[PDB]
UniProtKB/Swiss-Prot annotation, chain A:
Protein name: V-type proton ATPase subunit E
Organism (species): Saccharomyces cerevisiae (strain ATCC 204508 / S288c)
Keywords assigned: Acetylation, Coiled coil, Hydrogen ion transport, Ion transport, Membrane, Transport, Vacuole
Family: Belongs to the V-ATPase E subunit family.
Primary location class: membrane
Residue numbers spanned by region Interaction with VMA10: 12-31
Gene Ontology annotations for the cellular component aspect, listed alphabetically: fungal-type vacuole membrane; Golgi membrane; membrane raft; proton-transporting V-type ATPase complex; vacuolar proton-transporting V-type ATPase complex; vacuolar proton-transporting V-type ATPase, V1 domain
Subunit structure as annotated in this protein's UniProt entry: Homodimer. V-ATPase is a heteromultimeric enzyme composed of a peripheral catalytic V1 complex (components A to H) attached to an integral membrane V0 proton pore complex (components: a, c, c', c'', d, e, f and VOA1). Interacts with VMA5; the interaction is direct. Interacts with VMA10; the interaction is direct. Interacts with RAV1 and RAV2 components of the RAVE complex, which are essential for the stability and assembly of V-ATPase.
GO biological process: endosomal lumen acidification; Golgi lumen acidification; proton transmembrane transport; vacuolar acidification
Swiss-Prot record, chain B:
GO molecular function, one term: ATP binding
Quaternary data: V-ATPase is a heteromultimeric enzyme composed of a peripheral catalytic V1 complex (components A to H) attached to an integral membrane V0 proton pore complex (components: a, c, c', c'', d, e, f and VOA1). Interacts directly with VMA4.
Taxonomic source organism: Saccharomyces cerevisiae (strain ATCC 204508 / S288c) (Baker's yeast)
This protein's name: V-type proton ATPase subunit C
Note: Present with 21114 molecules/cell in log phase SD medium.
UniProtKB/Swiss-Prot annotation, chain E:
Localisation: Vacuole membrane
Quaternary structure (record): V-ATPase is a heteromultimeric enzyme composed of a peripheral catalytic V1 complex (components A to H) attached to an integral membrane V0 proton pore complex (components: a, c, c', c'', d, e, f and VOA1).
Domain of life: Eukaryota
Name of the protein this chain belongs to: V-type proton ATPase subunit a, vacuolar isoform
Entire protein: shown range: 150 to 248 of 840
Purpose of the protein: Subunit of the V0 complex of vacuolar(H+)-ATPase (V-ATPase), a multisubunit enzyme composed of a peripheral complex (V1) that hydrolyzes ATP and a membrane integral complex (V0) that translocates protons. V-ATPase is responsible for acidifying and maintaining the pH of intracellular compartments. Is present only in vacuolar V-ATPase complexes; enzymes containing this subunit have a 4-fold higher ratio of proton transport to ATP hydrolysis than complexes containing the Golgi/endosomal isoform and undergo reversible dissociation of V1 and V0 in response to glucose depletion.
Anything else known: Present with 55714 molecules/cell in log phase SD medium.
The family this protein is said to belong to: Belongs to the V-ATPase 116 kDa subunit family.
Length: 52, 112, 112, 52, 68
């Protein structure tokens, strides 16, 4: 259309897209770390139970 | 009725004044939305306020508003402009929320 | 613009980006070259204070804008109903406590 | 000009595709490595306990 | 020629400019508008007579805009 509006929007939509990608990133790290914690604390309890 | 009036007056005026602030902050947020749409990447700019004696809009807006619209577009030029909505046809709605024909910038009715 | 009728004034906001210019004479930028352009050398032109607000989608932008606009105008009508019932209370034969120092503070600045 | 459109639209789609594939495989690898290191940790701990 | 889900349509050459410009601002004009004249259009259907139209081509990468 006109250079200014395209210049703004072309980059801005993808800027929000990557903001959403950052939100996805934070979500994946958070959930994966929580799964890590719970699986560790669940396996260790049973290991020690059997050991003792 | 005596107590009713004499207290409710102060209560209502107090609620009124405390509300005013958010009642206008919402439209401030609206124009911020309008901005982040119309020019995007830096979400804020000189979103300018005006303070001028009343009964003068006729010869206190046209030149500057038309010039800023001129800058805001480079493919269309006509004579009739506004915001109104009339259910006549696809034409004649004039907003970015409803249809529009020629409406570059954004302003609103602001008064206490 | 404005909506009321008193010994008070009228107010507007506008979107002005950085790339924009106040085109009336070449060789200048936004903040300067617009000090008394609005006739009279009487007005006072300032900006509005508001930062970004974190947003995910433009499709979001539109929906919040619409719902807001709805509630905004609804509460504009609500405040109209208020001033109506306040006049019904008739604290003064004429309108009272409006245009008086807002929250005990002189009206002119109390929005800027 | 059809290659301009090819590149533009394909990049628009593939940016979303890349970010989503990242969000997926990042967490997939996180789960795999979490399983592996949890297993080795619990096994080593079991051995040290068995020492006593 | 250009400048998954994509939308390409026509409207009778009576209101085409209407939406052509509406999208310019309600949608920010955020889609690269591209429409062409029709070579030898044909009869409309409702009252079954002739008309002209144009063929707008619209891309996207925002989604609900399509539902709009």
């Amino acid at each position: 259309l006109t250079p200014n509006q395209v210049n703004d929007e072309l980059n801005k939509m993808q800027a929000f897209i990557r903001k959403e990608a950052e939100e996805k990133a934070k979500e994946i790290q958070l959930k994966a770390d929580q799964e890590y914690e719970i699986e560790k604390t669940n396996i260790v309890r049973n290991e020690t139970n059997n050991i003792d | 009725e005596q107590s009713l009036r004499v207290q409710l007056v102060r209560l209502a005026k107090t609620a009124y004044v405390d509300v005013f602030i958010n009642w206008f902050h919402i439209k401030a947020l609206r124009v911020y939305v309008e901005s982040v749409l119309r020019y995007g990447l830096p979400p804020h700019f000189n979103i300018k306020i005006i303070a001028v004696p009343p009964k003068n809009l006729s010869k206190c807006k046209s030149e500057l508003i038309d010039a800023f619209g001129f800058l805001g577009g480079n493919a269309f030029m006509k004579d009739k402009k506004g915001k109104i909505n009339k259910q006549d046809t696809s034409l004649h709605q004039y907003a970015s929320l409803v249809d529009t024909e020629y409406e570059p910038f954004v302003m609103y009715i602001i008064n206490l | 613009m404005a909506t009321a009728l008193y010994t008070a004034n009228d107010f507007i906001l506008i979107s002005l980006p950085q790339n924009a210019q106040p085109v009336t004479a070449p060789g200048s930028k936004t903040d300067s070259w617009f000090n008394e352009t609005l006739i009279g050398g009487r007005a006072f032109v300032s900006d509005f204070k508001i930062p970004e607000f974190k947003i995910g989608s433009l499709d979001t932008l539109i929906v919040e804008s619409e719902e807001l606009s709805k509630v905004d105008n609804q509460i504009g009508a609500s405040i109209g109903k208020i001033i109506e019932i306040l006049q019904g209370l008739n604290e003064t034969s004429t309108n009272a406590y409006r245009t008086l120092p807002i929250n005990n503070m002189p009206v002119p600045e109390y929005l800027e | 000009s059809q290659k301009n459109g090819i590149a533009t639209l394909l990049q628009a789609e593939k940016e979303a595709h890349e970010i989503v594939s990242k969000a997926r495989k990042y967490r997939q690898d996180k789960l795999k490595q979490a399983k592996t290191d949890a297993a080795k940790e619990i096994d080593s701990y079991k051995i040290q306990k068995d020492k006593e | 020629e250009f400048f998954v889900n994509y939308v390409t349509g026509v409207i009778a050459r009576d209101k085409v400019a209407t939406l052509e410009q509406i999208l310019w601002r309600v949608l920010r004009g955020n889609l690269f508008f591209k429409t062409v004249e029709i070579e030898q259009p044909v009869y409309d259907v409702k009252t079954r007579e002739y008309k002209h139209k144009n063929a707008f081509i619209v891309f996207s990468h925002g989604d609900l805009i399509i539902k709009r």
